Design a protein around this ligand. Structure first.
Ligand SMILES: CC(C)(COP(=O)(O)OP(=O)(O)OC[C@H]1O[C@@H](n2cnc3c(N)ncnc32)[C@H](O)[C@@H]1OP(=O)(O)O)[C@@H](O)C(=O)NCCC(=O)NCCS
Ligand SMILES: [Cl-]
Ligand SMILES: [Cl-]
Ligand SMILES: [Cl-]
Ligand SMILES: [Cl-]
Ligand SMILES: [Cl-]
Ligand SMILES: [Cl-]
Ligand SMILES: [Cl-]
Ligand SMILES: [Cl-]
Lengths: 725, 159, 77
């Protein structure tokens, strides 16, 4: 090349080698003797390892062939480009939008934050040791921009610590391909970073002239200060919302500023240069279109604010419902998702800094069973406490991993329950059963949300969840009856006291009665009202599944769907396919997975094989049930929503939704919409198919599991659709 | 059109290169030679090509399928479909379906207990082909294909 | 006395020059019948610059020359 060091470096390329011998001719001759199918390699080596290899002289697999413009090739960090204020702000704005593209849009670190030449420059001086890496002689480029780069670089280092905890799955929830950058302890501490940004703010405030670009750069600086403060929620477990509120306000201010001005960063400030010249074991990747605004910072700040609310929890049910609803409506920002388990399960091996792992677990058992269990350090309790904590952490996973996490749980809860049963520890065995059966149900219904089940499988899954919901409702019913017996036993003591007169035996009965009221009655009432909510929740689940089952049976009665693959195939059979689908539940003893023949027989009882007038009467009973039960479901959801709005002190229902009140209401509103749509869809199907039979040239329909936009898609709508061509 | 399906000849270097050319066109991120070496040299009997005998170039392959098989857990043999490509001019003639049928038939004769593949959730054409053969979705992988979207894991039980 | 074999070269650092003025130094993982190479711990050297590229496969056409340090060559024999 024309450059001096490139010319001279070529002479010293082979200097590290004392002697070199050309072997090209020998290699070809030896390769000629080899057979085409032959491969010479280490015997231990597995050729699967070679499937992640690069290839030279392949545009899409060779990083060295990346085409760059002259501006990209010759961009100098030491040059202060013109105009400085307009260019420094544009650089800072693009870097922040690179951060959003990185974290919110799941883009790679090399094509986002590392694409900025200044971040590459700043990080390189930190690796060597230790003042900005570049010097242009201009105060905006050297001090203001230098502080900005430090703030973002401090942020990525904090993200690295979050990922090191192993809360979420790397290169899926969050990419951290930092191209071999290790800064050790050379990168400055938090106080230094904020002061550098604060000093740059005071520089900006000193400027007499006021420009639109300057206003944005002031806000950009304040945004970075807030992002640097994100670590406070882990270092000090801070619940304060000031920097988060400031981040929202500054992002909103910049969003209104965007249309009024134009930003053009120096050409070559952001490029694929670092992929071409820095050490890179990965293929070249183009830079993806960046977000247009700063709304991504608003989502990040609100998701993190939701995380901090769990610190206000005062019961096991309040933490439980927080975990059930905080990430349920839509997937939270990955930072908030990593933050929650680290914020929930802390450094001192405590939960929220309030209780130990076994104290936290015994709280869940006490609120569910209303019993104080009279050793300490018990292995079964220790194992169950770890299992419960894993359950909380799974709630923070992405929408796909969330379902996958239950695979592991179902077999471990089962084994745990069988171990409690063998030692006749029936209270813990009971709470373990509730968690397992609830997880089985949640794992099954979640498959519909991910479109895992095909329309012909909808009867198998919905009827199975109906079957599981029936056993969970029977178990919860017995649990509430046992609670009622204990309540009435205390009540009967008071009745017995009234019949008694003053004596030593009445003293003892009043002593027993006062102890029960002081130590047992209040928890019994709460558990009763909690189990009341669970029974209404599970009957809604049971009713919805049954409605879906009836809907499927109506479609099969008209010949539109079967409970197996319609397309005939030579390779497999329907029994093998059925068993594969229910393989996760095959090893669970109670409730036993119904046999294949039970699935078939149950469908036959639902399906209307009658014809003509007899068919119409049986069809009318099925449609009337769907319409009737939808209205009952709506009424049950309404009672639950009223209980949520009223609180847990009203004496009828206990929902523990105080921390996620808006989200739980939003969920049941979506559930109510799906319920109404199920009824409306049933009428459309029946009106359509009656007309269709009359016509000899009927349409060919297919059934699709359709998601309702504002509904809850654990129960998709089985929708008819004309098959075209 | 007179489509002929035949097994891979490992001794034919030209056949090897035509397959790589055909598969690489449809991939956003291509495979290196040693990706192809891993499949074809170790499982030569599980790669099939389709040629149009009455076309101007009869010997050139316009469709191909690449498979492997390995024990899964310890007790079951899992067949795997890694690559499937049909030339753009020859789409819609049942060629891919026939290539999947002949490959699965071969793995069944080699005592595979099940067949596994991954595909995009947005690949309606691939889902229709496979699910119509008996495949069902056993898993959904979040951003498995990055910006192209999630994946479905499809399994067809043979035993 | 004993003819050199490709098996002996496996696991030994090679110096491979490409058609362009870039040099790849890496450990030989495998070689096939058409002299396609798979190299590990590859260092790409172009003029002044140096960088690591990990596991790289080098096709036959792309190989200008292959060289091994004389000390290591005499040990393999
Ligand atoms: C998918 C692909 C192989 C099909 O090519 P093809 O030779 O035309 O396939 P076929 O003609 O055998 O299709 C047979 C069945 O597959 C489905 N299919 C094929 N094209 C389809 C399309 N546009 N839409 C929906 N289904 C389609 C149908 O079920 C079809 O049967 P049908 O006539 O009742 O509609 C082609 O798109 C391709 O080359 N894909 C490469 C990438 C890929 O998808 N790999 C799969 C992951 S292993
Ligand atoms: Cl730019
Ligand atoms: Cl609980
Ligand atoms: Cl309670
Ligand atoms: Cl115990
Ligand atoms: Cl009372
Ligand atoms: Cl109420
Ligand atoms: Cl209608
Ligand atoms: Cl050919």
């Amino acid at each position: 090349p024309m450059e001096v060091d490139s010319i001279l470096g070529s002479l010293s390329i082979t200097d590290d080698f004392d002697q070199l011998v050309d072997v090209t001719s020998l290699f070809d001759e030896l390769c000629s003797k080899l057979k085409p199918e032959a491969i010479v390699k280490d015997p231990r080596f597995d050729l699967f390892e070679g499937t992640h290899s690069l290839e030279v002289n392949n545009s899409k697999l060779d990083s060295s062939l990346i085409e760059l413009t002259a501006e990209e090739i010759e961009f100098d960090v030491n040059v202060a480009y013109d105009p400085p204020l307009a260019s420094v702000a544009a650089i800072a704005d693009r870097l922040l939008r690179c951060v959003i593209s990185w974290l919110n849009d799941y883009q790679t670190l090399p094509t986002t934050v590392l694409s900025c030449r200044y971040t590459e420059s700043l990080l390189s001086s930190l690796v060597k040791g230790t003042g900005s890496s570049w010097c242009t002689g201009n105060i905006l480029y050297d001090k203001v921009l230098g502080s900005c780069i430090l703030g973002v670089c401090y942020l990525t280092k904090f993200v690295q610590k979050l990922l090191s905890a192993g809360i979420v799955f790397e290169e899926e929830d969050l990419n951290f391909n930092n191209m071999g950058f290790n800064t050790f302890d050379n990168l400055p501490g938090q106080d230094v970073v904020i002061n550098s940004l604060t000093e740059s703010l005071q520089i900006l405030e000193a400027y007499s002239d006021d420009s639109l670009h300057l206003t944005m750069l002031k806000h950009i600086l304040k945004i970075i200060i807030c992002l640097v403060h994100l670590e406070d929620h882990l270092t000090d477990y801070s619940t304060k919302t000031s920097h988060l509120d400031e981040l929202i306000e500054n992002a909103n201010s910049v969003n209104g500023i965007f249309p009024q001005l134009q930003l053009s960063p120096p050409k070559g400030a952001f490029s694929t240069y670092i992929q071409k010249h820095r050490s890179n074991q990965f293929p070249p990747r183009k830079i993806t279109k960046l977000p247009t605004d700063y709304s991504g910072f608003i989502t990040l700040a609100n998701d993190v604010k939701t995380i901090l609310l769990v610190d206000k929890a005062e019961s096991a049910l309040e933490t439980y419902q927080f975990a059930k609803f905080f990430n349920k409506l839509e997937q939270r920002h990955v930072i908030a998702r990593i933050l929650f388990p680290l914020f929930f399960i802390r450094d001192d091996r405590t939960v929220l800094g309030k209780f130990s792992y076994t104290q936290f677990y015994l709280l869940h058992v006490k609120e569910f069973s209303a019993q104080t269990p009279s050793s300490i350090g018990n292995e079964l309790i220790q194992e169950s406490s770890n299992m419960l904590l894993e359950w909380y952490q799974n709630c923070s996973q992405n929408t796909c991993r969330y379902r996958q996490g239950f695979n592991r749980q179902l077999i471990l809860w089962d084994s745990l329950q069988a171990q409690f049963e063998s030692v006749n520890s029936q209270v813990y065995c009971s709470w373990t059963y509730f968690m397992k059966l609830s997880s089985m149900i949640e794992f099954s219904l979640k498959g519909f949300d991910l479109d895992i089940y095909k329309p012909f499988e909808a009867y198998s899954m919905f009827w199975y969840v109906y079957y599981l919901s029936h056993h969970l409702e029977t178990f919860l019913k017995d649990s509430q009856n046992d609670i009622e017996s204990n309540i009435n036993a205390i009540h009967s003591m008071n009745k017995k006291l009234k019949k008694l007169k003053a004596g030593e035996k009445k003293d003892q009965l009043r002593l027993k009665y006062r102890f029960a009221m002081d130590n047992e009655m209040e928890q019994l009432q709460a558990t009763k009202q909690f189990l009341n909510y669970l029974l209404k929740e599970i009957n809604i689940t049971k009713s919805l599944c049954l409605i879906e089952v009836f809907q499927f049976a109506i479609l099969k009665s008209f010949g539109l769907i079967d409970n197996k693959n319609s397309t005939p195939s030579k390779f497999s059979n329907e029994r093998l396919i059925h068993n594969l689908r229910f393989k996760p539940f095959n090893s669970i003893g109670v409730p036993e997975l119904p046999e294949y023949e039970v699935f078939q027989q149950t469908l036959k009882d639902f399906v209307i094989e009658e014809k003509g007038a007899a068919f119409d009467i049986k069809l009318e009973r099925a449609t009337n049930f769907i319409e009737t039960e939808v209205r009952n479901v709506v009424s049950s959801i309404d009672e639950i929503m009223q209980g949520i709005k009223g609180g847990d002190n009203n004496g009828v229902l206990v929902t523990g939704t105080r921390l996620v009140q808006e989200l739980s209401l939003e969920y049941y509103c979506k559930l109510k919409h799906t319920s109404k749509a199920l009824s409306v869809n049933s009428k459309v199907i029946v009106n359509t198919l009656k007309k269709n039979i009359k016509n000899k040239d009927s349409h060919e329909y297919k059934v699709e599991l359709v998601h309702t936009t504002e509904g809850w898609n654990y129960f998709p709508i089985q929708t008819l659709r004309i098959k075209q061509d | 059109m007179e489509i002929v399906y035949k097994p891979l000849d490992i001794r034919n270097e030209e056949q090897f290169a035509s397959i790589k050319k055909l598969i690489d066109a449809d991939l956003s991120e291509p495979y290196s030679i040693y990706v192809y070496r891993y499949f074809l040299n170790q499982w030569p009997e599980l790669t099939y090509i389709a040629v149009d005998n009455k076309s101007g170039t009869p010997n050139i392959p316009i469709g191909c399928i690449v498979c492997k098989m390995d024990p899964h857990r310890n007790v079951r043999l899992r067949g795997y479909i890694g690559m499937l490509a049909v030339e753009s001019t020859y789409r819609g003639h049942g060629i891919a379906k026939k290539l999947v049928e002949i490959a699965i038939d071969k793995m069944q004769r080699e005592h595979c207990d099940e067949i596994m593949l991954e595909t995009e959730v947005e690949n309606s054409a691939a889902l229709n082909l496979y699910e119509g053969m008996g495949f069902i979705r056993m898993k959904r992988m979040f951003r498995y294909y990055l910006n192209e979207g999630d994946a479905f894991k499809l399994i067809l039980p043979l035993t | 006395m004993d003819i050199l074999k490709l098996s002996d070269f496996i696991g030994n650092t090679l110096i491979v020059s490409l058609t362009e003025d870039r040099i790849l130094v890496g450990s030989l993982v495998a070689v096939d019948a058409q002299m396609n190479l798979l190299l590990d711990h590859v260092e790409e050297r172009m003029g002044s610059s140096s960088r690591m590229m990990g596991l790289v496969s080098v096709p036959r056409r792309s190989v200008k020359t292959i060289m091994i340090d004389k000390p290591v060559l005499q040990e393999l024999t």
